[PDB]
Design a protein around this ligand. Sequence first.
Ligand SMILES: O=C(O)[C@H]1C[C@H](O)CN1c1ncnc2[nH]ccc12
Length: 167
Amino acid sequence: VNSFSGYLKLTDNVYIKNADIVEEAKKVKPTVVVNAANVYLKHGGGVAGALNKATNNAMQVESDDYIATNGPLKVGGSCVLSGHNLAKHCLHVVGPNVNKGEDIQLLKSAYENFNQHEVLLAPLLSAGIFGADPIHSLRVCVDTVRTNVYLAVFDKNLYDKLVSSFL
Ligand SMILES: O=C(O)[C@H]1C[C@H](O)CN1c1ncnc2[nH]ccc12
């Protein structure tokens, strides 16, 4: 039993809700919140810009030190950093950004990072400003993640479409 509330159960391990991931994290304080990161951990817009703003830019400060030490992530890769005031940890995961020409096949590799964590609060990778089809992202999530994932979909219209079209 965990403290997530109001989610629709899609499969044995995937749950979905129309919610602002920032407000959800603040309420639940999950062990792991997933950020929709880029390889430079430059948290400018979308989910990443929103999470970082909620940390008063502390996420960006920590991220800049991470990059200065380690260099950029790989597309499809991840790193674990602090969750600041939002969660214990933040798993920064880089899905392919179609608006950059990146291979959508890397979306499965991106979701594989979730399997290293027993429970996560997450967005749909590569959706929104990353330019992929969210219906496809949800399908890859369900077919790749085996740990317990609580998906927050900001757009209510999109949430309704994601639910109605789920196979
Ligand atoms: O449009 C949406 O609903 C999704 C898809 C996109 O990739 C990011 N976005 C979000 N999802 C959940 N919480 C969020 N807080 C701020 C933005 C946001």
